[PDB]
Structures are given as structure tokens and as C-alpha cells.
Write a protein that binds this ligand. Sequence first.
Ligand SMILES: [Hg+2]
Ligand SMILES: [Hg+2]
Ligand SMILES: [Hg+2]
Ligand SMILES: [Hg+2]
Lengths: 573, 568
Amino acid sequence: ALEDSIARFQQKLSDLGFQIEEASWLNPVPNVWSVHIRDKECALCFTNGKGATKKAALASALGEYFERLSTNYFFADFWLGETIANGPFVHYPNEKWFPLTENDDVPEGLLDDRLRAFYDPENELTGSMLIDLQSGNEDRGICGLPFTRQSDNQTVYIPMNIIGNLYVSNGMSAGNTRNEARVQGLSEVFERYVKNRIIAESISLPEIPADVLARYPAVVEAIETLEAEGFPIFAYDGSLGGQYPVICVVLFNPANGTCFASFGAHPDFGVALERTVTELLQGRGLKDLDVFTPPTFDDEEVAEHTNLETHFIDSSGLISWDLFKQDADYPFVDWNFSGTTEEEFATLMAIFNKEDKEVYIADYEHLGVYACRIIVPGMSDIYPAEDLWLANNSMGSHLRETILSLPGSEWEKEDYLNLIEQLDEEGFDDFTRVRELLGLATGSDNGWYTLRIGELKAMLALAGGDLEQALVWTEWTMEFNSSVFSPERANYYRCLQTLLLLAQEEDRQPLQYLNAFVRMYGADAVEAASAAMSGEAAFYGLQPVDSDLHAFAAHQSLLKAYEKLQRAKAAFW
Amino acid sequence: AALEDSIARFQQKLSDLGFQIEEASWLNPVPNVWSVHIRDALCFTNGKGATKKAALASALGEYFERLSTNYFFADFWLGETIANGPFVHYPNEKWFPLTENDDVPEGLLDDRLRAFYDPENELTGSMLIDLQSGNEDRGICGLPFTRQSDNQTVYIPMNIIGNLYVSNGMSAGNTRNEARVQGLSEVFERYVKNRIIAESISLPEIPADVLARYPAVVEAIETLEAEGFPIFAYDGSLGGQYPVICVVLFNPANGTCFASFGAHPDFGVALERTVTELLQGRGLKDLDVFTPPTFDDEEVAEHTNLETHFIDSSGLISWDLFKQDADYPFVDWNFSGTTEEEFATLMAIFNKEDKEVYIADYEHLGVYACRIIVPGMSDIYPAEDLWLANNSMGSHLRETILSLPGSEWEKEDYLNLIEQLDEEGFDDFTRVRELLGLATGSDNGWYTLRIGELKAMLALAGGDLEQALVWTEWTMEFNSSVFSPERANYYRCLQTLLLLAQEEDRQPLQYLNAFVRMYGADAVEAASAAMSGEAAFYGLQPVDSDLHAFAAHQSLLKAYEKLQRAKA
Ligand SMILES: [Hg+2]
Ligand SMILES: [Hg+2]
Ligand SMILES: [Hg+2]
Ligand SMILES: [Hg+2]
């Protein structure tokens, strides 16, 4: 059966043009496996899997692969270029574009009353904020994705922009049947929602009694081995008195005084438990358990939304000491929500119903595996709605063309300095990587890979002939990036910094030092740095970039992959 | 002397003293550049030269140099027994007991030195107690030096020597004058070094036709260049005044520079010694720990930058050193001759500078060695350090502190001690072993004990947990790095418990089992015992007046005893 699911996933992938390879494999303790898998064409296009056996792990990873392919999630941080942005469809043939209105209100056919209120309580939200990153196509309008509201059965259109910023990869799954995927999606919503409550409210949870654990000897053996290897484990029921199908497992690493909390959910208690333990060690051997944090008594810090966001991103957030209290805030419950997938779905939906929460579900068949994306506003959100104002991944796209065209530019000095001011008016953090802000797959072998806003200001100051500013930002750049620069790029900045420092020396004659600089930095770096100081060529190591990004090999590879999916969408619809 | 003969003569005299010396590590990083490292096991020196044999003779020379001056022992208190024995440093020495108004006793120094070290006349005898004895009752131990102008014996406090001159102006050799010439050369090396650096002087390059008189050095230099390391070779004579060379290396990988200074009456020998010191102790992969040049001349000139330069040559250098135009013309200088001639030539320089020279000679290990002092030139630390950074300050409290482990005093006593440490102005980061002069070894808490951590222990023993938390946080912040895993785990546990004690709405028993799982039972037991005041001095064994408690220190005193033997 498993050997057959695997084979069947692998065949459907080949048939889509995807050649996948197992990269790294781990069996750190008995009954715990993880595997990493990627595109041969494309190493950044990967998933991971976990399980009680080698085969289970691989099936997990291929499952996740279809989950991420079906939701376009590999591509969610990137702009897909001018051609795709004007093609027949961008995300799905299904999608609906709502062009902007004169007073820039959110167009009439998007969302529903509940959602408008949830995302926009102050009624201060505008349509131009909602342009999806992938297209950036303001003229074409707001791309909305169809979801099915479960209370009735109505299709609701939700801006991709809102999905991408607030829900990220949460509530997504693949499965063998439509409902099976739905159940996993819903389970995951509960996993992350309950996780956040446990953490943010500093809840002391009830231990799973040893007689319950002993129904699951494979997990027990995994646990005991971890203990035996120097890692105390706490196994907790996270149901909050039987409300939710959630387990929590925590690991201590006494070597450095830290803890690491893993949360899993499934209608079957045993399976939830196994999943929680297998996720704990996913991607990690026993030498990789040293990057976590000590518990804390500062509950206010534990509760901060950013701490929860961190926990979602890498599980390296703060946990309260209270989670480990002798006495629990809830009795243990030997819960169970299992049944047929149809039963399971209804059981989980009933929970959402008693909570008075609407569920929105999109289903995808088009790669020949069932997959869903589920949104439960007030429960499935990873980032709070104000992020549509403060941390929108689309903000930054009006400037893309300007910035992509700085290499080779030749504007008047004033223009470049105004751009520094624009970047400050628009509020960009000096540490923001420019590639993330604009959605570019750069590759590692150019200056764009490591270009943050602060460095960009330095280049702009150089091109605009303001050397007081250029020095400020060049220092900033050296302080916060020499680490990651190639040796050639770091040498260039070291040279440049020295030259900018020298230019502020009112009692010193530059020609006295030129020979010494050539010996320290080499002639090319000196030539290049001096050219940058003249404003001649400030955009050191930045090649110019077209609208379809032919300049970046990485980004071309990304789009070759994406085209395979655009193909499969066209067939299916 | 011939090298084979110096080596032989040295190795024999060492065995005869009871010293088994072992060539440890050897380097020949480029042609005609050798260094060697030499051990008993923390009793060590290094040597440098153009050949393997030269390096070894250098190292053994240095070994006798350091043995004869007691320099291996300079940072350490030698215990109550030695401090009350017949003599501490040398049978020669003279003890000057303190006076009622606590003036500096009459028979020490001379008028010129009193005035130099104590211009304000603000100096007291109790400041001048040597670190090795700490014996205030016995008085100020003074060492006899010979004033060269008229040959009079002058007694100089060991305290002043140890704090201001450290290892500068010391050498050994085959003849008396050979040692003296190297000593005097060294005084010029370090004095001129400091001027070049502190005044941001641009020096004149040595022309290639002069370098070519010395093909061995040239080949060394060209290899370094070829390996990616630009070299500047400078005349440091300051227009032919001083017999000094400067060689600077760039590491373009890093953007850093490393400046080496050598001195000898023979230009060729000074040049070789400078290049050979540059790479001493270092292969070509070890040239990455230095500093970029700078335009901040005020920083370059700071005495602490010069002190750093003396300690590890990792100080700041001005970009000006590398200016196209030099502040002095190159001079093809030369002061060489017979040893006897060389000594006189160097002495004449000091005479034209109106500087007195004081020299102590030591024959007692069968090798000629000297220590030379030229106030105003050989000083490494400025005279005000006798007030501000005296290595004896901290010795009145030694007994107290050594007896804290196991102590059962009043809570009040311990807390007053925190106040004392603050009144006396000790830096929280001062390692206690340095402050008291203890060779601890690495496997105990004393190795890593800084004043801040000590305050933590004192607060714990005195039952002040608000303070104990403060200092325990401080300790974790500035030391978890170097602690053994066991010691770091203890502090992590303790910190957690102190934090818990500040929690007004939490019940400690709720967390105990979890703490035991994280920290282990011993650490929990221990940390709780420390919190009760029961046993605050975690991992600190108690220490007797002769330091039998520290194996390291016992080894140090076994070595010292060999020298004390040789002194009679
Ligand atoms: Hg790629
Ligand atoms: Hg990819
Ligand atoms: Hg020693
Ligand atoms: Hg030793």
C-alpha cells in the first residue's frame, strides 16, 4: 500500500514534468524518520516528510509536495514577471479580477460582510493595498480566489494578497480523497490555533498517563530512546479538556537549558501523538537540537504575537515555565474524534460550528491529487489583519521598475537622492532584503542576493554624490553584511569604506595613500571604489534586470517550473 | 659564540639546575625564517632565527633570561612560606620597612627616580609592596641595580619594576656585554616603536639595493609577497638616530596590517630580527588576527593602544605609516663593531639623550643576563599606574577571599565584603586569580572567577537575593562562554531559581520536578543550598597560605625552588 502510494505520487509527478529526488534522510531514533525531497531542475522547490518508517516519511514528503504545488505555494514570495502577469490567468483559471474603483474602495464582489468586518474593522482599507505580489498588475486589478463558504455553500472570492499575507501555508493539505484532504486541513487549523493558545496563555497541560502511552509502543520507544540520549520528554494532551484533537510534546536539552515544543493534530489520538513526535525531530538529528530557547517566566513576552509568529516559522519561540507545572489547568481526557473520513469531517466542522466560526474551503484536483486550502478567520490566521497595512508583501511593488533599472542608469544626481527620501517616506526597514521586497529569485552569485535597503541607500548616495550619506550607509553595510558577502564583494566595500573615510579627512591628502590602498585592496577594487565615489558606477555587482527577469537564472528556473503548473491548469479547466 | 656551542652550553646548565626542557613546536613558514617553542609545562619561551639552530639558541637564551629575572613568576604570589624565608627574589635584595608617616623609605631609588616616578611627592611606601611576597611587615623589597653614570648601586622596589617595566630590557647571552647590547637594543626597539606608532610617523622605505645586501631576508620577503602578503620594509632610525627597523605585513584577505619592530647595532641583524619576529609563533594561516589601519590618530596615540601593541602587536596603526612621503630620509645607518664597541655606542646614545641607565646583571644560573631600566624610555606603563593599576592592590584582601569556601561568618560580614570590593574600586571583570596572584589550573571555579561572580556568591552567602540575582545574571552574561558545561548548568539553574524567587504570584513547588529534569538533581540541590546561604561558593575549594590546593601553583613553586637553591 505505502510502496504503491509512493510510486503513484512519483508517476504523477513525472507525468507533470517533475523529476524529484530524495536528498537527505534521518532516522534519529526508532520509529522516527524524516526525509527531504526536491526538484532536480530546482533545489529551492522542496518539501519535507515525516513518519514512523522510511516509507511513511517519503509518502509524507510527496504528499506535502502536491500540497504545495497545488496551492502555488513555492511561488508565493515571488513576482512572476510581466508576461505571466498579463497572461490568461495567474493563479488559477477560476480566479476573478476586480479592477479598482475611483474612491479606491474594496470592489463590491470580493469577500463577504463577515470578512470585510474581520479584515477591516476601522473601514480604512483600500483596494490598491490588495494587489497580489505574483502579478503586481494594478491595472488588471485585485485577483480574488474562489473559496466555498461552508455554512451555506456559496462561492466567496478572497484576494490572493490577503491569503498570502495572513494565512501563508496554514490550512493546506493533500490526500487521497477530497474529504481526506479536508480533514487534514481542518486538523491543521486546530493544531496551529490550539498551539497558539497554549503558548500565549501560558497553559499548564496535563500529562498523558503511562497506561495510555503504552497503547502506542512505537512512540514510547521513540520517547525512551530520546530520554536515553539525554533529552527529557514531556508528553501532553493539548485538547483543553477534550475540546480539540491536539497533542503537545516537549523536549528538554539539558546541555544548554532549552526547550522545544511540538504540536500535532489528528482525529485519532494515537495518530496525533505519533505525528507530534515525528515532527519534533523532522529535519533534525540528535546534534541539531541545540538551537532552541530556555523557558521563561515573562508571560507578557510569551504572549506577544511576534513570539507566536516565530513559533510558526521555526518553533524557536519562548515557552512559559508554566507549561511544565506539576498541576495542570485541564484534566487529561482520553479523547477521540476518529471515524470515517465523512464522520471526521462532520465532527471537526461541528467544532467550528459551536465556536460560531465560518469555514472557507478551496479544493484542487488539477495535478491529479486532491488538495485543499482552508481559511477560518479568527482561527487559521498566522498574521493579524493590521499586517495588510504594516507588513504587506505587495507594498514595494510600485518601485520595482525604478530599482531594477538602477544598474547602468545615468539619471541626474538629484533623482538618486530623492529615491533615498522615497524609501524613507514609504517606511522600508533598512534591513529588508531588496529581493524579498520585490520578489526576486536572484541566485547566490550576485550583489542582489545580499542587497538590503541600507546598502541600496549607500549606492544611491554614491550615485547622487552625497558622500557624507554614502559613508553612513557604507559603514552600515559593512557592519551588517560583510559576514555574507563573497570575499570579492567584502574587499570592495572595505576599500570603499576606507576611501569614504579618507574623503572626510580635512587635514589629509589622498594621493599620499593611494599606493598603500592598492597594496591592501588590489587595483580593481580601488578602481571600482573610486568609480563609485565619483558617481560613475555606484551599483557595484548589480546587473540590470528586465521585466521577465531573464537576468536571473534562478528566477528563470522558477518560471520554468511554474509553467508546468500553468499547463496542467489549462488541461484541467 | 658559535651556535652549536651556545646550545650545548645552555642545555647542560639547564639540566644541572634541574630543568628538563623540551622543544615543543617548530616552524619554518618561509625560507630563512624559523621559530621554536620550548617547555619544562607552562614554564616556556620562544625563539626565532634565520635557521633552526639560531631559533633554538634564541629560545634557550630567552629561557635563561626569564629564569634569571624570575619573570615566569612575576604575576603570582608565592605564598606565606616563601614570603618569610631568608630571601624572596634574590639574596642581594634589601627590605625597607615602612615609616610612620608612610613615606617612601630613605635608602630606595635616587633623587632623579623619586622625581620621575613621584613628581607630585604624593607616593606612599605601602603602595610598593611586591606581589610575590605581599609581606607588608617585612617591608618594601628593593632590587640592586647599577647606575652606569657613576657605578653606584641603587635599590629599586620590585613593585615598581614589575608594574612599569615588565619584561622590557631583559636579555641573556654568552658574554656579559652581549646580553647588555641586546638589552639596550631592546630598550630602543620598544621606545622607538612607541614613537613611530603614537606619532603616526610616515617612515622611509629601505631601498632595494640595500635589501639586496641580505638575500636571505629578501627571499623571505619575496616568498611572503608570493603567498599573498605585501610587505613594507622601513628604516625606523628616525634619520639615523636609533638602530631600529620596521617591517609591516598586509593581509589583503582581511584588510589588516601587522607591524614588527626590531633593533640591533648591525643594520642587517636588526632587519633579520624584525622579519623573524614578524612570523614568530605563526605560520601563514595564523596571520588573520590583526587589525586594519585607521585614520583616528587620537586612538592610535592612546597609551592603552601602545600597551596592547606591547602585549600582542594587535594594536591600531595609523594609515600614515604608509604614506608616499616619509617624515625622515632613509639612512643607511650602522652602529656595529665588537660587542664592547656596540655597548659603548648604545650607551652614548642614552648619554646624548640625557637619560640615566640602570643595569642589574645576573650570573647565578651560570649564564649572563641583565635587566635594564631607562626611566623615560624603557617604561611600558606610565608612572601613574602605581596608583591606578598596581598589581599589588588586592593583596590585603587575599586571606579573607581565600578563606570564603566553607566559611561560616555572619551574613553581615559577606555583604560588607561586597561593599569593600566596591569602595576599593575593583573592576567587576577582574579575574580574581590575577588580582591575588594565583595559578589555579583550569578545572575549578577559581580559574574563571571574576569580581562580579564573587559578588554573586557573597550576596548568596549574605542572604541578599535581589543582589544575588543581579550578579548571577551578570555572571551568566559574561562567563557562560568559558565555564565548563557543569558550571554553566549550575548557574543556569541558579539563575532560574533566583528569578523564580522574585515571582510574587507563583508557587515554587510547582516547578521543581521540571527543574530537576532540566538541570539535574545535583545542580538543583546545590543551587538551592547556595540560595539558603548554606554553600554559596560553588566549585571553589578552600585555599591555604602555601596554595597546596592548586596543583598548578605547586608546580610553579617546585620550579621556583630550583632557582632559590641556585641562588645560595
Ligand atoms: Hg532553482
Ligand atoms: Hg523553486
Ligand atoms: Hg611555570
Ligand atoms: Hg604547570
